[PDB]
Design a binder for this molecule. Structure first.
Ligand SMILES: *[C@@H]1O[C@H](CO)[C@@H](O[C@@H]2O[C@H](CO)[C@@H](O[C@@H]3O[C@H](CO[C@H]4O[C@H](CO[C@H]5O[C@H](CO)[C@@H](O)[C@H](O)[C@@H]5O[C@H]5O[C@H](CO)[C@@H](O)[C@H](O)[C@@H]5O)[C@@H](O)[C@H](O[C@H]5O[C@H](CO)[C@@H](O)[C@H](O)[C@@H]5O[C@H]5O[C@H](CO)[C@@H](O)[C@H](O)[C@@H]5O)[C@@H]4O)[C@@H](O)[C@H](O[C@@H]4O[C@H](CO)[C@@H](O)[C@H](O)[C@@H]4O[C@H]4O[C@H](CO)[C@@H](O)[C@H](O)[C@@H]4O[C@H]4O[C@H](CO)[C@@H](O)[C@H](O)[C@@H]4O)[C@@H]3O)[C@H](O)[C@H]2NC(C)=O)[C@H](O)[C@H]1NC(C)=O
Ligand SMILES: *[C@@H]1O[C@H](CO)[C@@H](O[C@@H]2O[C@H](CO)[C@@H](O[C@H]3O[C@H](CO[C@H]4O[C@H](CO[C@H]5O[C@H](CO)[C@@H](O)[C@H](O)[C@@H]5O[C@H]5O[C@H](CO)[C@@H](O)[C@H](O)[C@@H]5O)[C@@H](O)[C@H](O)[C@@H]4O)[C@@H](O)[C@H](O[C@H]4O[C@H](CO)[C@@H](O)[C@H](O)[C@@H]4O[C@H]4O[C@H](CO)[C@@H](O)[C@H](O)[C@@H]4O)[C@@H]3O)[C@H](O)[C@H]2NC(C)=O)[C@H](O)[C@H]1NC(C)=O
Ligand SMILES: *[C@@H]1O[C@H](CO)[C@@H](O[C@@H]2O[C@H](CO)[C@@H](O[C@H]3O[C@H](CO)[C@@H](O)[C@H](O)[C@@H]3O)[C@H](O)[C@H]2NC(C)=O)[C@H](O)[C@H]1NC(C)=O
Ligand SMILES: *[C@@H]1O[C@H](CO)[C@@H](O[C@@H]2O[C@H](CO)[C@@H](O)[C@H](O)[C@H]2NC(C)=O)[C@H](O)[C@H]1NC(C)=O
Ligand SMILES: *[C@@H]1O[C@H](CO)[C@@H](O)[C@H](O)[C@H]1NC(C)=O
Ligand SMILES: *[C@@H]1O[C@H](CO)[C@@H](O)[C@H](O)[C@H]1NC(C)=O
Ligand SMILES: *[C@@H]1O[C@H](CO)[C@@H](O)[C@H](O)[C@H]1NC(C)=O
Ligand SMILES: *[C@@H]1O[C@H](CO)[C@@H](O)[C@H](O)[C@H]1NC(C)=O
Ligand SMILES: *[C@@H]1O[C@H](CO)[C@@H](O)[C@H](O)[C@H]1NC(C)=O
Ligand code: NA
Ligand code: NA
Length: 917
C-alpha cells in the first residue's frame, strides 16, 4: 500500500496570458517572466529599462495548464491530493475544470483533496493554476472603505503600492536595491499524492526540536542537562490510534556510527500530526559549532511511525540535524556584567553552546528577482565568498522570503549561522482576523519546516519597526498610534511568539530586527514579551545599531558612529564593475550619469510608478561627492575607461568606509558597550545596479569583500585617525576565546619605498597581549607633536601583525599563526603624492599563483581584475605593495568558460592609474 507520487515537474505545462493572445511552453517550478523569456517573447528581465518596460506582465493573470495527467488510479478507494510547496501568490487551482482551492500566500504549503473532481472526470484530468495580477488584487483590497488605512508616510511605496495587503515577497514590488517585477507562478516544488486505505502515509512537514532539558526561548540553557529530541510529523491522511514512534540517529558522515536507536515516549496524535520525544545523555552527542569555532557535526535522524498491528512503518521522515544551543540575548545587562565594567541597559548578542562570540558577516538579500532560477551552484558560490570573507553569520533579511531547505542545508554543512526573519518589512501591517489567520499558517509552516536546521540562529518578527516605522506612525498620526502599536504587539508578540514557543524551545525571538530589548518574557502575560521601547535611562546602552549617514564629511569620523551592542546594518552605495554593467546595459549607456544607469539606481526609490530621475540622481550625487572628497577623480580620454575608473573609485570609498566602521565596532568588544557583532549592509546584488552590495549579481567581488575579509580576521591591527586632533591610535582586536600574544611591525616609508628617518619617531615593532574577545591599544601618537614625518603627502605606515593562538575547540596541540596586513596614510587618498609604481604581473601555471611586483615605488590599492568568462575571487586584493616585495596572489576558480585563457586577461592597477589619461 505504498503512496503513488507524481512530481509536477515531470508533467507538460503551457503558460497563457489573460487575453488569450500569448501562449508559451511552461516549467514547474517556474514564474511567467522566466517562461516568457525562455520562449523569446521577452528579453532578459534584468536588462536595460525592463523594470518599466515589462510592467504589462505583472498587470495581468498568467495560467499554468498541464496536459491531461495519465497514471492516476480511478479507484474510489484512493485519496488523491494536490500538494504545493509554494505558489506565488493569489491563485485559482482547477482539477478537471473544478475549482478546488484559492491560495493567497507565497510562504505556505497548500494541499487539496481532489478525489471527487477525479471521479467526475470524463477523461484524463487537467490541472490548471491561474495566477492573478498581484498589483490589481491589492489595489482592489485597499480601495474598500471597509479595510484599514494608514498615513501616506507609513505605507509609502518603493514602486507598487499596497504591498502590506499581500503575503508575497515584499521586494517583488521594488526596493532601493532592486526591481519591481511582481512575478507569478509555481515558485516551489509540487506533487500529486495518491494514498490507499490502510496503506502508507505522506509526509507534509517535519519539525525536529533538539534542545537541552528545561530550555526556553530567549533564556540561557543549562549546558550540563541532557538533550531532548522532539519529533513532530505533519502528514496526509489517516493514522490509526495507539501509534508508535521510533528513531535512528546516525552520524551524517558515517552511517555505521549510531548515536541513538530506540522508541519515542509521550506520543501524541491528531487528524494530521504525530509527535514524540527521546531524551539522550548530555555526554553522548558531538556538538555542532559555527565555522572557525569547531566542527560542524551533523546527524541524520529518521523518524518511523508504526501502527498497532503493523509490521512495517506507515510514515517515515528524515532530516539532518545538529546538537547545539544558540541563544539570542536581549534581556537586561546583569549586575554581574555591570560589575565587570559593562555599561547597563540591555544585551544584543549571540551565544553558541553557552559561549559568547563576536558575530561577523552581512545581510543576505534575495540573489534574483525570480527564485526558481536560483541554483545550487549559484548559492554554493555565494557561500564560498561568505566563508572567504571570514563570516560566521548572515542575517536573512525580510522581505525577502523564507529560504528553502536546500539553502539552510548549505549553511548547516559550512557552519554559517542564519539570523532569520518573518516576511514583514519597512511598513505597518493589517491585523484583521483573516490576515492574522493567513499569517499564522505561514508562521506555523515555516517555523516547523526550518526548526531542524543547525544554522538557524534566531527568528525576528520583521524589519525596521520599533526603530523606524513605529516612530513614523506616532508622528504621522498621534491619535491612531496606540491602536497601531497594539496591533504590532498583537501580531508580532502575542500571536507570533506563541506560534514560535509552541513549535520550538531552542530558537530565541525578537518582535523586530532592531529594538531596545525586553523587560519581561512570560507566556502568562497578555503580551508575552514586554518590550522596553523608549523606557530608557541616560547613559545606558540598548539594542543593535542600524546606521546610515550619507554626509560624506563625517564618513571617517568615529564620533559620528553609533555606540551599541551589535551592528546589524550599516553601509553606503557603490557602482558595480563595468563587466557587470555590460551584462545588462547597452554600450552607449556605459557612462556614470546615463539615463539607463540613473534609472537603475533605486537609492532613492521612485515612491510610485514614475520614472523618477530626481530621486535616483540623489544616490548618484552621494557617490560623486564621496569620490570627490577623498579619492583621485578620473578623467580618462576613453569614455569606457572613464566610466570603469569612476565605478572603481566609488568602490574604494565604500570599502574604506566599512573598514572604518567594522574596526570601530570590533574594538567596542573591549569597551564598556561590549559590542559583539558586525553585519554590514549588504552582502549581495539582486541585479546589475549601484547598491550597498559587496558581491555583484553574478558573484563578482567589489573592493569591499577584500577589505572586509581582512577586517574580519581573527586578530587585527587597526589604525584610528582623529584627523581634527591629528592623533593616531593603533589597537589590536581579537575574537578568539583565549588570550593571545603577538607582535606588530610598524614601517614608515615614503611613496617611493625609501624609509622615513628614525621610522618617523615611531617604534619599528611592538609586542601585544590581548584578552579573549577583547582589544588593546598598542600605539598612541600625534602626527605633528610626537612624530617626525617630513611630508605627510609622501608617507605611508605599513602595519603587519603576527600572533599565535588556537581557534575555539581545536583538538590540535599545534597553535595557529594569525597574520594581518593593514596600512595608515596620514593624508586622504586624493592627497597622497603617488607616482607610477611600475607594476609587473605574471601567472605561474604550476603554482596557480599570480606574482605582483611594484618596481618603481609604493603601490596603494593594488587591484587585480579577473575578466568576464571566469567566476571566483583572489586570495587578496586592494593591498599596499612596497618596491621589490614579490606578492603571490592565488585565485579560487569556481567556473571557467575561457579554457584557462582567463589568466592572460587578468589586469593589475593601483591608486596611480585613476589619474592617468
Ligand atoms: C514537541 O513539539 C510539539 C510541537 O511540535 C509540542 O506541542 C505543542 O505544544 C504547545 C504548547 O502546549 C501547543 O501550543 C498551544 O496551541 C494552542 C492551539 O492548539 C491547537 O492548534 C495546534 C496547531 O494546529 C495546527 O498545526 C498542527 C501542526 O502542524 C496541526 O496538527 C493542526 O492540524 C493545525 O494545522 C492547521 O493550522 C495550521 C495553522 O495553525 C496550518 O499551518 C496547517 O496547514 C493546518 O491548516 C494543535 O497542535 C493543537 O492540536 C493540539 O491540541 C489538540 C486538542 O486541542 C490535540 O488533539 C493535539 O494532539 C494537540 O495537542 C497537543 O497540545 C496540547 C496543547 O494545546 C496538549 O495539551 C496535548 O497534550 C498535545 O501535546 C490544537 O488543535 C493554543 O491555543 C495554545 O494557547 C496558548 O497557550 C500558551 C501556553 O501554552 C499561552 O502563552 C497563550 O497565551 C495561549 O493560551 C491562552 O489561551 C488558552 C485558551 O485558548 C487559555 O487556556 C490560556 O489560559 C491562555 O489564556 C489566558 O491568558 C491570556 C493571556 O496570556 C488571557 O488573555 C486569557 O484571557 C486567559 O486568561 C498554545 O499555543 C501546540 O499546539 C502543540 N503543538 C502540537 C503539534 O502538538 C510538544 O509539547 C513538544 N514536546 C516536548 C516534550 O517538548
Ligand atoms: C485572475 O486570477 C485571480 C486569482 O486566481 C482570479 O480571482 C479568483 O477567482 C476565483 C474564481 O473566481 C475565486 O475563487 C473563489 O470565488 C468565489 C468567491 O467570490 C467572492 O470572493 C472573491 C475574492 O474576494 C477576495 O478578493 C478580492 C480581491 O480580488 C477582495 O476584494 C475581497 O475583499 C476578498 O479578499 C479577502 O479574501 C482573500 C481570500 O479569499 C484574502 O486574500 C484577502 O486578504 C481578503 O481577506 C471576489 O473576487 C468575488 O467578487 C466574490 O466576492 C467562490 O465562490 C469560489 O468558490 C468555489 O471554490 C471553492 C474552492 O476554492 C469551493 O469550496 C466552492 O464550493 C466553489 O466551488 C464551486 O464553484 C466553482 C465555480 O465558481 C466550480 O468550478 C466548482 O466545481 C464548485 O462547484 C472560489 O473560492 C477567487 O476568490 C479569486 N481570487 C481573488 C484573490 O480574487 C481571477 O478570476 C483571475 N482573472 C481572470 C481574468 O482570469
Ligand atoms: C552625475 O549627476 C549629477 C548631475 O546633476 C552631478 O551632481 C553634481 O555634482 C556636483 C559635484 O561634482 C555638485 O556640485 C556641488 O556639490 C556640492 C553640493 O553642495 C558642493 O560642496 C560642491 O562644491 C559643488 O558646488 C552638484 O551639486 C551636483 N548636482 C546636483 C543636482 O546635486 C554629478 O557630479 C554627476 N556625476 C558624475 C561623476 O559625472
Ligand atoms: C570623466 O568623467 C568625469 C565625471 O563624469 C567628467 O567630468 C565632468 O566633465 C564635464 C565636462 O563638460 C564637467 O562639466 C563636469 O563638471 C565634470 N564632472 C565632474 C564630476 O568632474 C570628465 O569630463 C570625463 N572625462 C572625459 C570623458 O574626458
Ligand atoms: C492582447 O490583447 C490585448 C487586448 O485584449 C492587447 O491590449 C494586447 O496588446 C494584446 N497583446 C498581444 C501580444 O497581442
Ligand atoms: C487606498 O484607498 C484609499 C481609499 O479608497 C485611497 O484614497 C488611496 O488612494 C488608495 N491607495 C492606493 C495607493 O491606491
Ligand atoms: C544524511 O541525510 C542527508 C539529507 O538530509 C543526505 O544527503 C546524506 O546522504 C545522508 N547521509 C547518510 C550517511 O545517511
Ligand atoms: C521620491 O519621489 C517622491 C515623488 O516625487 C518625493 O515626494 C519624495 O520626496 C522622493 N524621495 C526623496 C528621498 O527625495
Ligand atoms: C578586556 O581586557 C581588560 C584588560 O585589558 C579587562 O580589564 C576587561 O575585563 C576585559 N573585558 C572582557 C569583556 O573580557
Ligand atoms: Na546608571
Ligand atoms: Na533595510
Amino acid at each position: 500500500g505504498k503512496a503513488s507520487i507524481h512530481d509536477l515537474a515531470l508533467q507538460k505545462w503551457t503558460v497563457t496570458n489573460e487575453y488569450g493572445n500569448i501562449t508559451v511552453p511552461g516549467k514547474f517550478p517556474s514564474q511567467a517572466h522566466l517562461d516568457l523569456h525562455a520562449a523569446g517573447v521577452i528579453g532578459e528581465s534584468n536588462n536595460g529599462l525592463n523594470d518599466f518596460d515589462l510592467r504589462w506582465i505583472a498587470a495581468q493573470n498568467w495560467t499554468y495548464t498541464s496536459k491531461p495527467i495519465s497514471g492516476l488510479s480511478k479507484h474510489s478507494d484512493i485519496a488523491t491530493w494536490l500538494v504545493f510547496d509554494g505558489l506565488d501568490t493569489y491563485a485559482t487551482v482547477k482539477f478537471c475544470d473544478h475549482i478546488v482551492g484559492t491560495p493567497d500566500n507565497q510562504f505556505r504549503q497548500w494541499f487539496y483533496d481532489v478525489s471527487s473532481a477525479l471521479a467526475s472526470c470524463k477523461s484524463d484530468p487537467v490541472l490548471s493554476i491561474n495566477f492573478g495580477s498581484v498589483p490589481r488584487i491589492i489595489n482592489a483590497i485597499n480601495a474598500s472603505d471597509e479595510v484599514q488605512h494608514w498615513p501616506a508616510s507609513v505605507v509609502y511605496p518603493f514602486e507598487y503600492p499596497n504591498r502590506q495587503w499581500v503575503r508575497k515577497e515584499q521586494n517583488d514590488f521594488g526596493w532601493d536595491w532592486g526591481p519591481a517585477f511582481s512575478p507569478v507562478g509555481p515558485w516551489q516544488p509540487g506533487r500529486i499524492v495518491q494514498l490507499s486505505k490502510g496503506g502508507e502515509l505522506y509526509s507534509l512537514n517535519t519539525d525536529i526540536d533538539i534542545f537541552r532539558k528545561g530550555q526556553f526561548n530567549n533564556f540561557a540553557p543549562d549546558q550540563t542537562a541532557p538533550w531532548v529530541v522532539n519529533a513532530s510529523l505533519d502528514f496526509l491522511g489517516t493514522l490509526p490510534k495507539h501509534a508508535s514512534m521510533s528513531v535512528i540517529i546516525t552520524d551524517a558522515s558515517d552511517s555505521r556510527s549510531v548515536l541513538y536507536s530506540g522508541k519515542l515516549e509521550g506520543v501524541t496524535q491528531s487528524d494530521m500530526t504525530v509527535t514524540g520525544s527521546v531524551t539522550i545523555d548530555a555526554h553522548k552527542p558531538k556538538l555542532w559549532w559555527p565555522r572557525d569555532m569547531g566542527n560542524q557535526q551533523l546527524y541524520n535522524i529518521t523518524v518511523s511511525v508504526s501502527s498497532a498491528g503493523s509490521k512495517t512503518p506507515i510514515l517515515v521522515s528524515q532530516r539532518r540535524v545538529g546538537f547545539r544551543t544558540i541563544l539570542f540575548s536581549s534581556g537586561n545587562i546583569t549586575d554581574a556584567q555591570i560589575a565587570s565594567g559593562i555599561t547597563p541597559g540591555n544585551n544584543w548578542h549571540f551565544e553558541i553552546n553557552g559561549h559568547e562570540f563576536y558575530a561577523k558577516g552581512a545581510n543576505l538579500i534575495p540573489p534574483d528577482a525570480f527564485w526558481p532560477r536560483v541554483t545550487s551552484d549559484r548559492m554554493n558560490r555565494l557561500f564560498d565568498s561568505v566563508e572567504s570573507q571570514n563570516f560566521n553569520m548572515l542575517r536573512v533579511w525580510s522581505s525577502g522570503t523564507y529560504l528553502p531547505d536546500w539553502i539552510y542545508d548549505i549553511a548547516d554543512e559550512r557552519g554559517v549561522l542564519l539570523w532569520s526573519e518573518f516576511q514583514f518589512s519597512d511598513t505597518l501591517y493589517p491585523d484583521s482576523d483573516d490576515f492574522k489567520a493567513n499569517v499564522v499558517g505561514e508562521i506555523t509552516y515555516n517555523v516547523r519546516r526550518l526548526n531542524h536546521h543547525a544554522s538557524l540562529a534566531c527568528w525576528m518578527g520583521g524589519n525596521e519597526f520599533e526603530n523606524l516605522m513605529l516612530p513614523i506612525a506616532q508622528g504621522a498620526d498621534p491619535a491612531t498610534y496606540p491602536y497601531v502599536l497594539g496591533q504590532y504587539e498583537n501580531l508580532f508578540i502575542t500571536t507570533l511568539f506563541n506560534v514560535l514557543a509552541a513549535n520550538s524551545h531552542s530558537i530565541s525571538y525578537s518582535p523586530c530586527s532592531a529594538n531596545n530589548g525586553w523587560l519581561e518574557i512570560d507566556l502568562d502575560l497578555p503580551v508575552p514579551i514586554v518590550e522596553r521601547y523608549y523606557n530608557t535611562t541616560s547613559g545606558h546602552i540598548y539594542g543593535d545599531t542600524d546606521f546610515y549617514n550619507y554626509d560624506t564629511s563625517v564618513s571617517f569620523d568615529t564620533s559620528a558612529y553609533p555606540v551599541g551592542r551589535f551592528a546589524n546594518e550599516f553601509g553606503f552605495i557603490s557602482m558595480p564593475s563595468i563587466q557587470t554593467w555590460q551584462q545588462a546595459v547597452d554600450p552607449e549607456e556605459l557612462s556614470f550619469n546615463s539615463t539607463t544607469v540613473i534609472l537603475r539606481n533605486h537609492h532613492y526609490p521612485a515612491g510610485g510608478l514614475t520614472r523618477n530621475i530626481h530621486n535616483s540622481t540623489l544616490g548618484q550625487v552621494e557617490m560623486t561627492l564621496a569620490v570627490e572628497r577623498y579619492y583621485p577623480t578620473p578623467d580618462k580620454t576613453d569614455p569606457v575607461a572613464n566610466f570603469s575608473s569612476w565605478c572603481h573609485a566609488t568602490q574604494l570609498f565604500q570599502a574604506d568606509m566599512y573598514k572604518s566602521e567594522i574596526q570601530f565596532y570590533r574594538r567596542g568588544s573591549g569597551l564598556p558597550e561590549r559590542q559583539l557583532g558586525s553585519l554590514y549592509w549588504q552582502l549581495n546584488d539582486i541585479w546589475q545596479a549601484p547598491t550597498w552590495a559587496g558581491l555583484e549579481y553574478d558573484g563578482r567581488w567589489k573592493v569591499l569583500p577584500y577589505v572586509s575579509r581582512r577586517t574580519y580576521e581573527h586578530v587585527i591591527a587597526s589604525a584610528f585617525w582623529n584627523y581634527t586632533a591629528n592623533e593616531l591610535e593603533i589597537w589590536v582586536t581579537s575574537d578568539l576565546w583565549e588570550p593571545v600574544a603577538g607582535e606588530v611591525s610598524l614601517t614608515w616609508v615614503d611613496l617611493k619605498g625609501k624609509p622615513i628617518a628614525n621610522n618617523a619617531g615611531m617604534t619599528k615593532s611592538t609586542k601585544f597581549n590581548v584578552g579573549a574577545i577583547n582589544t588593546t591599544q598598542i600605539i598612541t601618537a600625534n602626527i605633528q607633536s610626537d612624530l617626525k614625518i617630513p611630508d605627510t603627502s609622501d608617507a605611508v605606515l605599513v602595519i603587519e601583525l603576527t600572533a599565535h593562538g588556537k581557534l575555539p575547540n581545536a583538538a590540535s596541540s599545534k597553535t595557529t599563526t594569525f597574520t594581518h596586513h593593514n596600512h595608515f596614510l596620514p593624508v586622504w587618498p586624493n592627497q597622497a603624492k603617488v607616482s607610477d609604481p611600475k607594476l609587473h604581473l605574471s601567472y605561474n601555471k604550476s603554482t596557480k599563483k599570480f606574482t605582483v611586483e611594484a618596481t618603481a615605488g609604493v603601490s596603494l590599492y593594488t587591484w587585480l581584475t579577473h575578466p568576464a568568462g571566469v567566476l571566483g575571487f583572489f586570495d587578496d586584493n586592494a593591498f599596499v605593495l612596497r618596491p621589490g616585495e614579490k606578492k603571490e596572489v592565488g585565485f579560487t576558480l569556481q567556473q571557467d568558460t575561457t579554457g584557462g585563457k582567463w589568466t592572460e586577461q587578468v589586469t593589475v592597477e593601483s591608486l596611480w592609474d585613476l589619474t592617468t589619461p
